[PDB]
Amino acid sequence: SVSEIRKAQRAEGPATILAIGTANPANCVEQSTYPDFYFKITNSEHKTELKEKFQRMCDKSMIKRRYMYLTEEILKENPNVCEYMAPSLDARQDMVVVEVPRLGKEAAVKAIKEWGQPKSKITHLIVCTTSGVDMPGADYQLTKLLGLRPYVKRYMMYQQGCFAGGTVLRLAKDLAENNKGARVLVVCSEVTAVTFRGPSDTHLDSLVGQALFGDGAAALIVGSDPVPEIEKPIFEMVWTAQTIAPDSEGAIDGHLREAGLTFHLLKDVPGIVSKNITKALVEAFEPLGISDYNSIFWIAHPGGPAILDQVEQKLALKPEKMNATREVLSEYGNMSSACVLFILDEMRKKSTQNGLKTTGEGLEWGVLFGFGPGLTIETVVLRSVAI
Amino acid sequence: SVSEIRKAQRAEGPATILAIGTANPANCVEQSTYPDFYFKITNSEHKTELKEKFQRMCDKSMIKRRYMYLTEEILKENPNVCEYMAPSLDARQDMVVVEVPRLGKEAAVKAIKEWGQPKSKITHLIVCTTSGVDMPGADYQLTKLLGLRPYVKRYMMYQQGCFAGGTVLRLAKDLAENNKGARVLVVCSEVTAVTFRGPSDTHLDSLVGQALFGDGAAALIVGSDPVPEIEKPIFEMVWTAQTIAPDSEGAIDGHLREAGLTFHLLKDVPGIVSKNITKALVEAFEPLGISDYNSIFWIAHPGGPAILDQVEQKLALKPEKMNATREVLSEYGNMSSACVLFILDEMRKKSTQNGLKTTGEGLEWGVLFGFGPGLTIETVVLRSVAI
Numbered sequence: 033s034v035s036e037i038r039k040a041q042r043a044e045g046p047a048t049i050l051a052i053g054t055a056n057p058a059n060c061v062e063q064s065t066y067p068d069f070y071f072k073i074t075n076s077e078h079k080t081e082l083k084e085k086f087q088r089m090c091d092k093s094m095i096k097r098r099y100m101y102l103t104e105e106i107l108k109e110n111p112n113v114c115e116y117m118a119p120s121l122d123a124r125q126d127m128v129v130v131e132v133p134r135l136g137k138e139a140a141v142k143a144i145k146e147w148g149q150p151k152s153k154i155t156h157l158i159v160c161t162t163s164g165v166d167m168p169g170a171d172y173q174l175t176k177l178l179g180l181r182p183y184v185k186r187y188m189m190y191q192q193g194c195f196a197g198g199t200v201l202r203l204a205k206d207l208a209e210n211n212k213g214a215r216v217l218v219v220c221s222e223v224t225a226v227t228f229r230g231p232s233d234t235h236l237d238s239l240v241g242q243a244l245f246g247d248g249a250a251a252l253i254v255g256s257d258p259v260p261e262i263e264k265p266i267f268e269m270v271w272t273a274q275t276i277a278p279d280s281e282g283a284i285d286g287h288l289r290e291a292g293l294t295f296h297l298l299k300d301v302p303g304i305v306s307k308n309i310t311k312a313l314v315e316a317f318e319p320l321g322i323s324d325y326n327s328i329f330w331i332a333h334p335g336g337p338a339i340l341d342q343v344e345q346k347l348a349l350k351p352e353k354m355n356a357t358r359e360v361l362s363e364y365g366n367m368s369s370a371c372v373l374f375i376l377d378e379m380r381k382k383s384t385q386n387g388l389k390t391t392g393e394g395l396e397w398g399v400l401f402g403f404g405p406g407l408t409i410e411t412v413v414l415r416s417v418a419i
Numbered sequence: 420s421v422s423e424i425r426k427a428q429r430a431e432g433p434a435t436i437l438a439i440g441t442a443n444p445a446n447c448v449e450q451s452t453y454p455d456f457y458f459k460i461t462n463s464e465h466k467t468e469l470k471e472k473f474q475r476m477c478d479k480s481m482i483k484r485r486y487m488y489l490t491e492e493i494l495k496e497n498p499n500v501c502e503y504m505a506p507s508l509d510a511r512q513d514m515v516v517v518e519v520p521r522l523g524k525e526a527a528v529k530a531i532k533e534w535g536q537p538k539s540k541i542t543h544l545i546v547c548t549t550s551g552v553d554m555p556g557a558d559y560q561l562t563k564l565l566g567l568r569p570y571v572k573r574y575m576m577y578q579q580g581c582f583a584g585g586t587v588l589r590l591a592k593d594l595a596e597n598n599k600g601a602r603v604l605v606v607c608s609e610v611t612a613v614t615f616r617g618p619s620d621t622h623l624d625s626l627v628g629q630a631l632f633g634d635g636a637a638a639l640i641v642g643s644d645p646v647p648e649i650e651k652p653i654f655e656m657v658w659t660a661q662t663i664a665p666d667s668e669g670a671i672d673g674h675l676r677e678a679g680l681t682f683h684l685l686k687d688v689p690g691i692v693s694k695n696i697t698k699a700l701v702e703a704f705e706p707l708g709i710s711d712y713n714s715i716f717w718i719a720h721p722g723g724p725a726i727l728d729q730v731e732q733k734l735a736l737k738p739e740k741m742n743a744t745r746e747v748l749s750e751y752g753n754m755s756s757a758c759v760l761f762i763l764d765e766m767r768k769k770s771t772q773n774g775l776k777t778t779g780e781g782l783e784w785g786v787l788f789g790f791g792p793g794l795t796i797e798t799v800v801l802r803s804v805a806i
């Protein structure tokens with residue numbers, strides 16, 4: 033009796049990305065002049081050596097601009113947020129418990145419009161953020177804000193960190209594939225109000241986050257068994273993995289404290305990622321008989337430019353493999369979990385725009401990686417779609 | 420090519436609970452004398468009317484004792500934790516980022532011993548808590564503490580609230596069923612260091628949490644396709660749902676602030692649960708042709724005794740249906756997400772102890788419910804196992 037129920041309940045084909053929409057706070061913050069702004073707004077003009085280090089960090093970041101909910105007016109009204117370490121969680125939380133779902137809604141509406149089907153057909157909702165927590169969560173807020181059915185099955189992923197663009201895909205794959213008819217709205221939405229803080233010369237690692245983190249949200253519709261010529265596949269998920277790199281304890285830490293979310297880098301993250309990326313690639317692609325990593329399309333979380341440079345160096349990737357990744361890092365900075373989903377959007381849009389054969393830059397197979405605390409690597413093996 | 424991969428990758432039978440282990444902080448806190456202790460340790464002896472209200476709340480709670488990490492010594496060393504609203508998140512976080520995984524490890528070791536198979540066969544790990552957050556999370560800590568493989572696939576569920584015993588089961592079902600060979604360790608671990616606070620006479624709702632919340636962890640092993648006579652099924656999952664009750668906005672709220680995790684009750688939760696439980700039951704059991712709710716075995720989150728009493732009243736359940744639920748509420752109080760998993764353990768152990776025909780009190784089908792913020796109801800339809 034349960035065998036028959038199980039058989040009828042499950043989907044049949046691979047989880048597929050059917051729509052992608054993104055959104056960012058309207059405030060565009062130029063990187064070239066950020067050092068000057070940031071040292072002024074934090075009342076840190078007298079830390080001249082630290083300022084010169086930050087200017088160097090920003091000039092090497094390979095980020096031209098970021099979008100930030102935080103403005104000069106907001107920062108003036110919250111001096112504790114501008115100090116390196118002052119009680120400020122309540123103020124930050126008040127900002128992000130609202131802005132995370134507001135921004136996620138904007139991205140989600142775009143994805144739902146692209147999908148083109150009734151929102152009442154969304155059966156599952158995954159919401160992911162590293163900024164702020166609340167009860168009921170941002171998943172409940174987004175259900176109310178979008179008018180989803182009350183029986184949407186929710187997955188609230190909080191405080192995950194940068195690898196979680198990969199995690200939401202690994203999660204969505206199983207929800208979609210094990211449930212016939214399931215249609216999963218996936219929303220990653222990240223806002224740096226929780227991480228922004230002033231500079232301190234004995235905390236240079238913290239300072240790196242101030243050069244790299246940006247705001248944004250991305251939404252997907254994921255489903256198996258797409259209805260031919262109603263729904264339009266963009267990418268198919270085939271296999272996923274998550275692992276912890278050896279010898280990386282405490283490489284990236286982040287505590288949610290009375291002074292907001294801190295950020296620490298205690299180890300060489302670019303070196304750890306680069307030393308462990310081959311292992312991740314042969315786990316994923318050796319069963320498919322592929323060993324040429326220039327023959328697949330690439331999406332990599334751009335935690336900072338050095339991760340990308342060292343990966344490309346280690347593997348001998350052609351410089352163009354990381355073009356889609358670098359273009360997102362350039363125009364939006366590191367948006368934690370959302371980043372990789374902006375990169376999928378950029379790649380399929382550019383592939384379509386340029387008349388390539390597939391959504392994966394003309395190639396059949398591809399890989400998406402998330403990197404973050406642990407040190408954690410998430411791997412998602414993708415197959416592109418024709419046209 | 421992907422069709423063949425998909426076909427080979429998925430499991431075939433229903434997700435099954437193969438082992439359950441639980442654990443609690445060693446400190447046993449008697450309810451009869453709690454009012455006296457709590458008003459003294461919080462320096463609230465002069466709030467005589469409030470004290471009499473709390474004594475009534477504890478005497479009606481139907482809780483005989485709870486286990487708490489917090490002790491008199493710890494409370495003396497943290498006066499801010501004893502005030503109704505004082506900066507104390509950092510201190511609370513320091514307690515629970517350690518104790519959540521420590522306690523989860525204790526429960527997990529018990530479940531793994533019962534399961535009897537190598538821990539290297541755990542492929543997925545779900546960790547769930549409403550107390551504290553950190554990066555890397557309690558899932559990373561539990562992977563290190565237990566010596567799981569580094570490539571265990573982790574699901575960190577933070578700040579979820581009381582319905583999440585149901586949520587981890589809904590999640591584990593899809594992971595197990597869509598992945599051949601998958602074996603999911605599920606750990607809910609809850610510690611009231613984050614919620615404990617002193618009493619305030621204009622915040623009586625908050626005070627209810629102080630009479631009801633307790634500490635504990637529960638762990639499960641979940642898998643499809645149990646290996647005959649190596650692995651031993653206890654309960655099978657068949658169907659799941661999550662929904663938001665109408666007219667319940669703001670019924671239960673909880674914010675993670677500089678003063679720790681607050682708790683508010685703005686609506687009649689027992690009444691909302693009772694008015695919406697029938698709908699949840701016919702969604703679940705009308706497709707199975709069952710309408711007699713005394714004919715199934717019951718597991719219900721015991722948020723407080725009034726929820727149970729009003730459910731039993733609304734449906735005309737025989738008083739014995741809630742025996743397993745009430746026994747856990749009596750001996751451990753409300754342990755948020757872990758509660759329902761302690762109740763499954765109690766029911767299968769008592770059914771086995773008393774020589775009943777099935778693990779579900781001698782009955783074939785059963786239901787598990789979680790209730791929490793939203794107002795959210797999680798439903799899990801279960802099938803028992805013979806013997």
Ligand SMILES: Oc1ccc(/C=C/c2cc(O)cc(O)c2)cc1
Pocket residue numbers: 162163193194222223224227245246247248284285286287293294295296366367368404405554
């Ligand atoms: O908009 C956002 C963009 C990026 C971030 C990053 C936060 C973060 C904080 C850490 O301690 C660890 C880290 O791995 C990630 C948060 C918000």
Ligand SMILES: Oc1ccc(/C=C/c2cc(O)cc(O)c2)cc1
Pocket residue numbers: 167549550580581609610611614632633634635671672673674680681682683753754755791792
């Ligand atoms: O050990 C524990 C036992 C219970 C709890 C409950 C916390 C909680 C706080 C709220 O604001 C909302 C609520 O629904 C749940 C936390 C720890």
